[PDB]
């Protein structure tokens, strides 16, 4: 069957399922193109991974993201995390782990919360 990988991103209480499969190069969120995320100032906050890594990878890859829960900001952060994780998972499973490591290095160099969640667990003095 078709190559497919599935990842999860999670901000405060926002979950984002990211499905990645080999396809024509379309990025849809909630059945709409990614160019129409809601808050419209954080459109680039969610464009981050694409412009961080380049796009030809996305030209070969097809991406689908479903979000539920959280606010606007939390949902946006969940979306970007889900895309980053899913992209690296796909590159790990179906293409060279050399490029896997280049992707992971670029993401973590830019902003690590693209990959590992920032679980804000409390602090008592």
């Amino acid at each position: 069957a078709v190559p497919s990988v599935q990842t999860f991103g999670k901000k405060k209480s926002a979950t984002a399922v990211a499905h990645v499969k080999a396809g024509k190069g379309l990025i849809k969120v909630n059945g709409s193109p990614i160019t129409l995320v809601e808050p419209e100032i954080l459109r680039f906050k969610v464009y981050e991974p694409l412009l961080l890594v380049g796009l030809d990878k996305f030209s070969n890859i097809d991406i689908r993201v479903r979000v539920t829960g959280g606010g606007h900001v939390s949902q946006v952060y969940a979306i970007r995390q889900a895309i980053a994780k899913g992209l690296v998972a796909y590159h790990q499973k179906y293409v060279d782990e050399q490029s896997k490591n280049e992707l992971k290095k670029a993401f973590t160099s830019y902003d690590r919360t693209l990959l590992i969640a920032d679980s804000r667990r409390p602090e008592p003095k």
Binding site: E97, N101, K104, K105, T108, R112, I116
Partner: protein, 266 residues
Amino acid sequence: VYSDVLALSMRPDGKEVAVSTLKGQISIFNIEDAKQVGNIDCRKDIISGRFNQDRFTAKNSERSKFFTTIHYSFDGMAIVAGGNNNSICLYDVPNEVLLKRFIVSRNMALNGTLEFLNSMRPEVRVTSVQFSPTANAFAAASTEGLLIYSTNDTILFDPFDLDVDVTPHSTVEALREKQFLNALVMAFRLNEEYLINKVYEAIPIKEIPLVASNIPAIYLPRILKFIGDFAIESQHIEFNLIWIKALLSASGGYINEHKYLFSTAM
């Protein structure tokens, strides 16, 4: 991190941590920024061992696919790694690659030593590794004892910034025509122990201070290190001591300003 850290070590300068997790990736963090400077995968460059009582292969099992022991080098540039596997892998930090991989023991009695079996028991494992604070050797404590790898052979032509006119014969001619500074510089440019030794024991006392004054700052560390590793097992004490006193006198402030570079030398 992404999974169970189980080994840790720290840059000698005191700025970074290197942590090996259970995926077999040696991540490296900057402390004050609490951020990830970079990680080194290790999953593929590990020679695990098969077990005669196993039902599966020596590749597709994660029996020892990770490193339970990490340590830095004393220039902060290299890492030694060892685990329950059969391999001791020597990576280097700043460029995220491996320099070497040693196999701890070929002994089919020890369990995880055959990669393919030839058609409870002692296993082989490296419990803990360290470099040497003299940074010419490192030790690995394993099921069979304390192995100690070293470099004290120096059978190797590792020159440095040579040029066409720097030859051993030219060095001898420099000695005969009494440019001791030039002879020493050329000796290090060649970087050969016997030639270094010859010129070093050739130059005279009433001229050691001038040479120590005029040695270039690139060669201060190499000369200090050589003097130390020679003066341990050499019998010309005040030769070595006049040399060291002249060196410290001529160039002390430089060493104080870059202490971390002359660590092993001092």
